[PDB]
Amino acid sequence: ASRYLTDMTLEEMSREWSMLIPKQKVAGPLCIRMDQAIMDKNIILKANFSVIFDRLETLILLRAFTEEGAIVGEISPLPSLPGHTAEDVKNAVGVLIGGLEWNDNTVRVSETLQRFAWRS
Amino acid sequence: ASRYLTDMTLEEMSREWSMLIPKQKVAGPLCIRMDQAIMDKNIILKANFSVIFDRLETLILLRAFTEEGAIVGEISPLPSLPGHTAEDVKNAVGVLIGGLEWNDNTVRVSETLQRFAWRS
Amino acid sequence: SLSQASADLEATLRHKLTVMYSQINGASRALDDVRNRQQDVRMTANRKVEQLQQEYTEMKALLDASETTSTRKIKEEEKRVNSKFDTIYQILLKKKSEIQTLKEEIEQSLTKRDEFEFLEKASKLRGISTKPVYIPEVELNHKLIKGIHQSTIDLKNELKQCIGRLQELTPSS
Amino acid sequence: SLSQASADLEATLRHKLTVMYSQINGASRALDDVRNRQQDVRMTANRKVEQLQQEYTEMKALLDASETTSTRKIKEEEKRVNSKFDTIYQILLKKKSEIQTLKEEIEQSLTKRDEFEFLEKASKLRGISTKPVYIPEVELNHKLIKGIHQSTIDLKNELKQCIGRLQELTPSS
C-alpha cells in the first residue's frame, strides 16, 4: 500500500507568496522559510507527501496557513532534491513551529502529518 | 534452525526410579511426580527437549537430580501424548519447584532450560 | 631583426607545444581515473544489492518454515480427531456385525422351525441381546485452529510494521 | 403343550427379529454420521490451511516490496554519483579538446613558419593558456549503503523472533 496525501489544493501548491520580513534557513536537505512579521495568528501546517508502509516517504511541499488562508511559512526540499527522511521533516517542523511561536502564534499540524510523520 | 537438547544421558533417560513417598499430579498435558521424602538437598532440573526458532518446541522428559545423581522428581508428557506448549512446561516447572521446596530443598534449572523456556 | 623575432617565436612555441602534451596526457589519465572510479561504485552497489537479496531469501525461507510448521499443526489436529472417529467407526461396524450375524442365525433357525427340535435350538437365541457400548464425544479444537490463523495475521501485521521502520530510515527518490 | 411352546418361541423371535432391523438401520445411520463428521473436519482444516497460505503470500509480497524498495535506494545512490562523474568526464574531455585543438593550430602554424608572415599569425597563440577548472570531490555514501544492509539484517532477525513467538503459542507433535 503506497498512497499520496494532499493537504493542499492544486492552487495552494502553485500560489506564490512573499515574506514581509524574510527568515530563511537550510536544514540539511530541506529549506525552511517564514514571515517573522506574522503575529498573534492561529497557523496550520499543511503538507503534500507520499506514504509507504504507512509511514512518510517523501515530502513534496509543506506550507503554513493562517485562518484567512494566507501562506506565512514553508518547508520544501532543496531544488537539487537531495534525499530526506521523516526525521529531517519532523525536525524541520519543530524548527518552523518554534520560529513561528516566537511572535506568539499558535501552530497546529494537519492530522495527515500527525498520523504519518509521528506515532501518536 | 531446529535443534534437540540433551541435558540427560542415554542412561539417565532410561534409568528407573521409585518415590519413597509418592506425590503425583497431572498438570494438563504433563505429569508431575516427586518424592516428598527428599529433604535438605540441592536439586537440579535437567531436560531433553527439542527447540525451533530458538524457543522450546516439545519436551521429551524432565527429571530432578540430587548432587549424588539420584532421580527425585520428573515432568513428562502424558502417555497419550497430548500437545503441550512452553507455557505448560514453565508452569509445571514452577509447580515441581514449589513442591520440592516444601521440604527445604534448593532447586536450580539447567541453563538449557533457562535459555529456551524463559527469556532471561 | 625580424628573422630573429621569428626564431624567438618558433622557440617559445615548440616549448609551448611540449607543455601541451604533458597536459593532454594528464587529461587522459584523469579520464581513466573517473571511469575507474565510477566502475568502482557499480561493483560496490551491485554487491550490496546481491547482499540484500541473500537476506530476503533467508527471510522467505523462514516464512516457508513457519508456514509448513503451522500447516503441520493444523493437519495433525485434523488427524487426531479423524483417527478417534475411525476407532469409533470400527466399533459401530463391529456392533453392527454382531447384530447382523445373530439375526442371520435367527433367520435360518426359523426356517427349520416346524421341525419338532426348533425349541431346544432357539431358546438360546432369545437371550443374547448384545447391544451396548458408550462413545465419548470427539471435539475438534476450533479455538486452536482459529488462533493459529489469527496470530498468523498478527505476524503479517508486525512484519508490515517492521518493514516500515526500516524504509523510513533512509530517503527515497 | 410343546407345539404351543414352539408357537410361543416363534412369536418371541419374529418380534426380536424386527427390533434387530431397527438397530441395524440405526447403526448404519450412525456410521454415516461419523463419516460426515470426519468429512467436516477435513473441510474445516483445509480451509484454514488455505487461509494460512494466503497470509504467507501477502508476507512474501511485502518482502518483495521492501526488497525492490531497498535496491531502488541503492541503485539511485549509485546513479547519483555516477551522473556527477559523467558531468566531470565531459568537462575534462572538453578541456582536453580545447588543448588538442589549439595545439593543432600551433602545429600547422609552425609548418608555414619560414614564411615571413609567421610572426604576425602566431603571436596570438603564445597568449592562450586556456587550462583551468576546479572539480569538487564526489563521495559515494558508504554509511547509507551499508546501513541499508545492516538494518535489513536486523529485519531478518526480528522476523525470526516474530516467528518464534507465534509457534510457541501452540503445541507441536
Author numbering:
A (entry chain B), B (entry chain B): 86 to 205
C (entry chain A), D (entry chain A): 190 to 362
Q: Which sentences did the original study use to describe this structure?
A:
Tripartite motif (TRIM) family proteins are RING-type E3 ligases that play key regulatory roles in innate immune signalling pathways that lead to the induction of a type I interferon (IFN) response and production of inflammatory cytokines through activation of the IRF3 and NF-κB transcription factors. Activation of RIG-I initiates a signalling cascade that depends on the E3 ligase activity of TRIM25 and induces the production of IFNs and inflammatory cytokines. An example is non-structural protein 1 (NS1) of influenza A viruses (IAV), a multifunctional virulence factor that binds many host proteins during infection, including TRIM2527–29. To understand NS1-mediated inhibition of TRIM25 activity on a molecular level we have determined crystal structures of the CC domain of TRIM25 in complex with NS1-FL and the isolated ED, and of a TRIM25 CC-PRYSPRY fragment, which includes the RIG-I-recognition domain of TRIM25.
